[PDB]
């Protein structure tokens, strides 16, 4: 829907599907208490004051990962709950707007607002300030089975963006060969970038989020996490490289064109269009639920139940009865090693401490000493022996055995739960 | 490349161009009559054969035009400005023929079974070398579209209250007794616990799948999967809203593995699922599910299969395939998919040497990836190993008695393997190599 929903006399759902912070201010001029949730509350532009900044209330800015940690809607603080930005398919995200949906009638809420620029389907438009190009198989410098003529990058600022962090440091090194001032950027730096203008091409991956560029060259692909139903002996959270969709595509081409004309230069013409998460998300949410907010897998079920219910919102496998019954059976877990996981960083703090449990409680040694692993460096009580492998959340090297008991009852879930 | 809701003009020089129409509106029929009214030859391309011969018969029938038709099974030729085939056929007439053809309509181009993605690329590959002037990529459906409201059709999310346990939800039997109802199940298998758990009951009701024809009453209620083409009177539609496709996994066991999986169903199975009810007697549409994925979108195991039909029917070489694949990815406004051409160019290279016998059977057997299994097949018999198991998928091998020593040296997975196996045959580490050299991170 192109225009704010007006408040009904009853509770209801609706969406809002904007253009490319005015909405809000209306609802609060007619008396209502408003509650904003975006993924995060930093300025949009990367530079400014907090959307949760007073005298700029009957408006609350706030996240969904702060409205989890909360608790949830209180029992009668908002007439309107806007849920921003909810094509957002990070874990967070979709488990806040699941449970936005699954309590704000009984928290005395009149409307629930689905806001987004990008609902399911949308495809990349066209940029009046922004020029783009295809790539040919032209050139001195080869990218994803095209060229890039030295001539568009040689001198002005240019932004360059790959899908790994060892495709970024590789095209850097040809580059700097070639006589380029070429900068390589990922997560766990920073600052390399030369802020004082002069000629730079940056070569980042989707860590980078603030200086200007004359044009961005595209590899149009991106790294997705994954879960593969591989039975060895269960499933295994990877990582896909897929083609990008269009939320990243509109977002990679938009580091260009700020102000002054830009040129995007891309690989393939096309994208994904927006709209699908994977199952590995689900797992994530559970994990999660789990970890850090006090949810009973049946909790969480019900959040996500209510997100999976709502028509208009990304779509996912309905895979609920399966992780509310995995997380079921991880019982006993050791509360150290949690912590340890949870403090971390880990992707999956309740899946890795459960493995770590099990190793410990057998005295049998990590699948790997990968840093995810860290929490059992008791490596000498422990060396003695085959893994008994739950699941695998990274590659394996020590020798494995599939017959604790955890592994047989996933199995038993993957066979019940999963459709044939 | 130019966007258009009605027939472009015939340019005076070569274009592509996109025609996104409601398919009511005789994409297939009425645009190509108005283009031939002009003066000009048009090929008109479809997927499906039984669609090719019906628009066929229907020019004939309601305009007493006798069109060009071109199947696989049936050729024929009136000589008319207006030639229907498929895509399937069109290549094997070895795609554009100099001068035949002004304008070419794609017709369904969202489609993404091999036929139409090696069909539309060796199109955009070859068309304005062959002469023509217009190149239409014909379609009700672009890439990114969603389900819109049908008129006719009132929609009904399904509740969990029902004695019908249906996908985790509930078909309560009030809303299907009586009248008649279409079931989509996504297996052959839930075909039937939805159709015998039904006459405790009351019934009329019986599931197709593929094996079967038609036990249709034209009081009903029937149980089916998507092999039921768009009949015959519904007054409801209930959808499981899942779908089963076809994917690869590069499961590095040694090499890859085709399989299939279960996903949530894209827009063109919605929208088609729930078109049969709400014609002309307007219909109720009950869902498991509100969601679906947009449309656009198609798996790499597809390429592969490209390549295989390439070199089984169309006596392609894999670097020819590649070139029409890469001006259909070139192309806008198409559906998308991972950039894996290099790698499976690279993987049937290598295939060399085949049997043209067990190739010819596997052909005709109408197996999926006839010339990788004939392949499989052609390695086994080499080094007296048996295949991977005794499917029907393997039968070129039936005087077996000679070819069973021991392991198979197995060169992807086709399938379940039942036999023991060796990783270590030079195709093996060829196809391994191949991975290394031309898949990402
Ligand atoms: C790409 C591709 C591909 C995939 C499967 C089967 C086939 C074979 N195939 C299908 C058709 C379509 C048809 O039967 O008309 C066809 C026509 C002539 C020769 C071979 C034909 C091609
Ligand atoms: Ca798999
Ligand atoms: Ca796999």
Redesign the interface.
């Known amino acids: 829907n192109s225009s704010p929903p007006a408040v009904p006399q009853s509770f209801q759902v609706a969406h809002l599907h904007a253009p490319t912070t005015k909405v809000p201010a209306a609802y609060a001029a007619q008396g209502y208490k408003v509650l904003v949730l975006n993924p995060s509350v930093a300025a949009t532009l990367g530079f400014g004051a907090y959307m949760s900044k007073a005298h700029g209330s009957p408006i609350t800015y706030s996240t969904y990962g702060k409205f989890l940690a909360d608790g949830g809607c209180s029992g009668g603080a908002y007439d309107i709950i806007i849920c921003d930005e909810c094509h957002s398919t990070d874990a967070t995200s979709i488990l806040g707007i699941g449970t936005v949906l699954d309590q704000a009638e009984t928290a005395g809420a009149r409307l629930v607002v689905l806001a987004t620029a990008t609902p399911?389907?949308?495809?990349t438009v066209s940029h009046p300030n922004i020029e783009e190009v295809?790539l040919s198989t032209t050139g001195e410098i080869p990218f994803?089975?095209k060229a890039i003529p030295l001539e568009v990058i040689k001198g002005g600022r240019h932004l360059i963006f790959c899908?790994?962090k060892?495709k970024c440091d590789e095209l850097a090194a040809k580059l700097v060969a070639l006589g380029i001032n070429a900068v390589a950027y990922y997560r766990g730096l920073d600052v390399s970038v030369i802020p004082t203008n002069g000629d730079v091409v940056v070569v980042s991956t989707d860590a980078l989020m603030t200086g200007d560029f004359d044009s961005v060259i595209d590899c149009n692909?991106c790294?997705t996490q994954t879960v593969?139903f591989?039975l060895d002996p269960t499933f295994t959270i990877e990582?896909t490289?897929?083609?990008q969709d269009?939320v990243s595509r509109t977002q990679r081409r938009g580091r260009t064109g700020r102000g002054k004309p830009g040129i995007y230069r891309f690989?393939?013409?096309?994208?994904?269009?927006?709209?699908?998460f994977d199952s590995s998300v689900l797992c994530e949410c559970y994990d999660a639920g789990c970890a850090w907010y006090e949810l009973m897998p049946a909790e969480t079920t019900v959040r996500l139940r209510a997100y999976?219910?709502?028509?208009?919102?990304?779509?996912?496998?309905?895979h609920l009865?399966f992780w509310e019954g995995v997380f079921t059976g991880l019982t006993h877990i050791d509360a150290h090693f949690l912590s340890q996981t949870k403090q971390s960083g880990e992707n999956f703090p309740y899946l890795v401490a459960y493995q770590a449990t099990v190793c410990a409680r057998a005295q049998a040694p990590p699948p790997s000493w990968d840093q995810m692993w860290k929490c059992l460096i008791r490596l000498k009580p422990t060396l003695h022996g085959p893994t008994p492998l739950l699941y695998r959340l990274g590659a394996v090297q020590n020798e494995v055995t599939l017959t604790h008991p955890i592994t047989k009852y996933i199995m038993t879930c993957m066979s019940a739960d999963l459709?044939?």
Do not use: F, I, W
């Open positions: 399911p389907g949308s495809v295809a994803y089975g899908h790994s060892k692909t790294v593969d591989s990582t490289t897929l083609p269009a690989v393939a013409p096309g994208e994904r269009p927006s709209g699908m999976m219910n709502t028509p208009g919102l990304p779509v996912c496998q309905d009865e459709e044939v």
